[PDB]
């Protein structure tokens, strides 16, 4: 028998990533895991045909079943409108999903010890998070001389404060009002603490509390208040810690570190993007790359392609590990981790796609024998996964 | 007989950079170029003794003489005030100079074929310049209530009110930001001037899809200034100006070979900072790093140092190249060019400081035999510059 995986929302996408997404299911997921699969086709022709209703239904399904795994999708522009003869310039599916779900986006690189890195000392992955909806900022044109003031009027009427933003004396310009609700800062803190707990790494928040004393100071304060009143014991029980750092000081210390921390910031086929909702229940994983149009155009002309599926595979493993965590499914938790180990071990043993071979040898030096095409790489992952799971019994 | 280099404003600085700066003058500039040198000592001690008046005078001299070359200076904090027994926590000399001159700062890395970078395809440098918010008005929203931003016209016409946010439950934070048209225009002029002098295309990146009014004014002003006064000059030089959304800009740059100016509305010894004034005549060149205090302490204790002088040498070469452009000085233009090529070529041939050796071999495997100390490196540049200039005499 296969592992009973439970309830998973799956989102199909476009171009080359749509092809490798089906190969991940066909060769790595379905031969070992049985799922109550809620599949939504977020392909550009389907989103056009349904007037983007499929994206909204897919977003509601993630809210209901707590686990979303998404394939890369085309965000329409004037060229795509002309290419597919679209009805509208459909909004980014990711934006629509994010708007309905809410949460914090965390990006994480997949580290293969034999693959070159910007900072060679980084041996453990760094996870970088930014809170999701400057979007809700009121900007405007100042047509000429005059004063721009910002006023705060409490609900009872009393303790009203007016601040001069600028007195324009020699002409016009622009001005804007920006805000941040406490709830959004608390959600950002929760998603960050819950992320650091599920990973088992220390958490660092970086602000500019020296430039924006009051604005960024409330981020530093809220994160500390939630840490002491709700997470300090859980962090100590997992030997990790939370600390705030100034961005200038944080960048400098990060270079001298070996990575392996969650980095909360106030302001390619080896990187994931995971939306972590404040509830600590709902997660949506996807590769942090696009649909790889250039490889898809080669595929369309009968040319052999060599597309890296690691980021797409890790969207499945991060989502399945989360599904296993919610359901206390030990066999699924094991599978999700074994698939990640196999992916890294295969590249570390020298079996990789052309892009990774180019990172090592340099593109002009890459020979056909230095890499595997899309299918051969998936088959090598499939053999190693069969072996790894057969050893585990 | 030395080159007549003309009028150049020079600013001396502090700690390790002050030492390197004197070696650059003594071994690479003075043996071949004679200048009507306007030197200002911006050392922490001199600024303290003169009550920062030296800084203001140096800034006025750059305005008058058009070319400034500056050594890195200590910006005081509470620890420096104790260390030097300063009368005040004097403002940053760069901030004082920028206040008097105006202009946009453009950073450009020095590329060496053997020194790794983010994208291997970037063979020509990318020059990035940001709009010169620190002057924003921020405050805490203690509880429920309305936050509005208003504009009262000076001509007595109707006051305009915008709702920033209505806090129905709980509080938060809020802020106001502004930008004057004149700064946006100055940013456009400095960027167009920078592109014309370098002979490279210019890209302005904004988030005009989100900040339709705020970033839309940057895009509109850059387009208006371009079409009405630079398009001809740009086409004549086979270059172009284009606005790009920050997302498309990051994508286009990754798949590029470098060689463009990037104005954006938002290893250290291998980057320069040039304050480019909107007039197209005034320029102030310096290294993007600081006074290298850690290295200075080692040098102070008689311990060997390996400090990268490239960024400081390029502050001089960019200023000399600007000077030659202003005076049509072909000999000074060739000299600045040759000093840049010697520096790059010396590194490329395996002669470099520890920081560069760490970029190729990785800090854990860098041996003493892989690099030259500060003095040994400067000597190697002096020796190669003499050879390059003698070989150039064959023209
Ligand atoms: N996750 C998402 O839903 C998402 C995010 C961004 C963009 N998009 C959409 O994607 C469409 C096309 O975007 P794009 O092709 O310019 O971006 P991209 O897919 O990220 O591809 C840019 C280049 O990066 C390399 N690359 C990226 N992913 C790779 C992988 N898995 N394996 C190997 N190489 C990989 C390829 O380099 P070479 O060309 O050298 O082979 C590729 O041509 C757009 O319409 C955009 O809206 C979707
Ligand atoms: N342009 C300016 O006038 C300016 C700008 C910033 C700061 N400063 C002033 O500089 C002083 C010291 O600041 P800081 O130590 O934080 O900054 P920094 O001087 O830029 O030095 C930081 C570190 O960067 C490396 N580094 C920088 N320049 C280098 C070079 N030319 N060659 C080799 N390594 C180099 C060294 O790393 P390792 O430790 O690995 O050797 C150095 O310790 C302060 O008093 C500050 O106010 C001046
Ligand atoms: C968005 C993102 C998220 C997570 C990661 C990355 C990126 C790109 N990576 C990276 O180099 N981030 C990075 C962080 C800071 C800098 C500074 C210090 C120059 C500001 C530069 C790059 C890839 C990388 C590799 C190994 C281990 N961790 C990572 N994590
Ligand atoms: C401040 C600065 C100015 C100029 C330069 C740089 C830096 C750091 N450099 C660089 O990597 N900038 C950079 C630009 C964009 C990105 C994105 C696309 C990832 C956002 C990342 C880095 C060094 C570099 C090397 C080769 C040629 N040009 C440059 N120019």
UniProtKB/Swiss-Prot annotation, chain A:
Acetylation at Lys-354 dramatically reduces catalytic activity. It is linked to Glioma: Gliomas are benign or malignant central nervous system neoplasms derived from glial cells. They comprise astrocytomas and glioblastoma multiforme that are derived from astrocytes, oligodendrogliomas derived from oligodendrocytes and ependymomas derived from ependymocytes. Genetic variations are associated with cartilaginous tumors such as enchondroma or chondrosarcoma. Instead, alpha-ketoglutarate is converted to R(-)-2-hydroxyglutarate. It catalyses: D-threo-isocitrate + NADP(+) = 2-oxoglutarate + CO2 + NADPH. It is found in: Cytoplasm, Cytosol; Peroxisome. Belongs to the isocitrate and isopropylmalate dehydrogenases family. Homodimer. Binds 1 Mg(2+) or Mn(2+) ion per subunit. The gene is IDH1. It comes from Homo sapiens. NADP(+) binds at residues 73-75, 80, 256, 290-295, 308. The record marks 135, 208 as: Critical for catalysis. Mn(2+) binds at residue 248. This is Isocitrate dehydrogenase [NADP] cytoplasmic. The lineage of its organism: Eukaryota, Metazoa, Chordata, Craniata, Vertebrata. Its main location: cytoplasm.
Swiss-Prot record, chain B:
Mn(2+) binds at residue 247. NADP(+) binds at residues 73-75, 80, 255, 290-295, 308. The modification Phosphoserine is found at residue 369. It catalyses: D-threo-isocitrate + NADP(+) = 2-oxoglutarate + CO2 + NADPH. GO terms for cellular component: cytoplasm; cytosol; extracellular exosome; extracellular region; ficolin-1-rich granule lumen; mitochondrion; peroxisomal matrix; peroxisome. The record marks 134, 207 as: Critical for catalysis. It is an enzyme of class 1 (oxidoreductase). The modification N6-succinyllysine is found at residues 124, 380. Acetylation at Lys-354 dramatically reduces catalytic activity. It holds the Pfam family Iso_dh. Binds 1 Mg(2+) or Mn(2+) ion per subunit. Keywords: Acetylation, Cytoplasm, Glyoxylate bypass, Magnesium, Manganese, Metal-binding, NADP, Oxidoreductase, Peroxisome, Phosphoprotein, Tricarboxylic acid cycle. Homodimer. It is linked to Glioma: Gliomas are benign or malignant central nervous system neoplasms derived from glial cells. They comprise astrocytomas and glioblastoma multiforme that are derived from astrocytes, oligodendrogliomas derived from oligodendrocytes and ependymomas derived from ependymocytes. Catalyzes the NADP(+)-dependent oxidative decarboxylation of isocitrate (D-threo-isocitrate) to 2-ketoglutarate (2-oxoglutarate), which is required by other enzymes such as the phytanoyl-CoA dioxygenase. Plays a critical role in the generation of NADPH, an important cofactor in many biosynthesis pathways. May act as a corneal epithelial crystallin and may be involved in maintaining corneal epithelial transparency. This is Isocitrate dehydrogenase [NADP] cytoplasmic. It comes from Homo sapiens (Human).
């Amino acid at each position: 028998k296969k592992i009973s995986g439970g309830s998973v929302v799956e989102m199909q996408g476009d171009e080359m990533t749509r092809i490798i997404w089906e190969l991940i299911k066909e060769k790595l997921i379905f031969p070992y895991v049985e799922l109550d699969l809620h599949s939504y086709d977020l392909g550009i022709e389907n989103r056009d045909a349904t007037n983007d209703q499929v994206t909204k239904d897919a977003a509601e399904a993630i809210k209901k079943h707590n686990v979303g795994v998404k394939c890369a999708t085309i965000t329409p522009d004037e060229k795509r409108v002309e290419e597919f003869k679209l009805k509208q310039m459909w909004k980014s599916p990711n934006g629509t999903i994010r708007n309905i779900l809410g949460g914090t986006v965390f990006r994480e690189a997949i580290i293969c010890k034999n693959i070159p890195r910007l900072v060679s000392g980084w041996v453990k992955p760094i996870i970088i998070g930014h809170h999701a909806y400057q979007y809700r900022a009121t900007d405007f044109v100042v047509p000429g001389p005059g004063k721009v003031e910002i006023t705060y009027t409490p609900s009872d009427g009393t303790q009203k404060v007016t601040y001069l933003v600028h007195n324009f004396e020699e002409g016009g310009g622009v001005a804007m009002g920006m805000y941040n609700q406490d709830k959004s800062i608390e959600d950002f803190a929760h998603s960050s603490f819950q992320m650091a707990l599920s990973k088992g790494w220390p958490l660092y928040l970086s602000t500019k509390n020296t430039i924006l004393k009051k604005y960024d100071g409330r981020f530093k304060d809220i994160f500390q208040e939630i840490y002491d009143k709700q997470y300090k014991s859980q962090f100590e029980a997992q030997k990790i810690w939370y600390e705030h750092r100034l961005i200038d000081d944080m960048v400098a210390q990060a270079m001298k570190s070996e990575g392996g921390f969650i980095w909360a910031c106030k302001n390619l086929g080896m990187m994931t993007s995971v939306l972590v909702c404040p509830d600590g229940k709902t997660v949506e994983a996807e590769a942090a790359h696009g649909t790889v149009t250039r490889h898809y155009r080669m595929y369309q002309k009968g040319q052999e392609t060599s597309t890296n599926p690691i980021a797409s595979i890790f969207a499945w493993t991060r989502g399945l590990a989360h599904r296993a965590k919610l359901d206390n499914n030990k066999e699924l938790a094991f599978f999700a981790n074994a698939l990640e180990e196999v992916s890294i071990e295969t590249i570390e043993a020298g079996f990789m796609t052309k892009d990774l071979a180019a990172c090592i040898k340099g593109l002009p030096n890459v020979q056909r024998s230095d890499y595997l095409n899309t299918f051969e790489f998936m088959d090598k992952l499939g053999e190693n996964l069969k072996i790894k799971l057969a050893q585990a019994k």
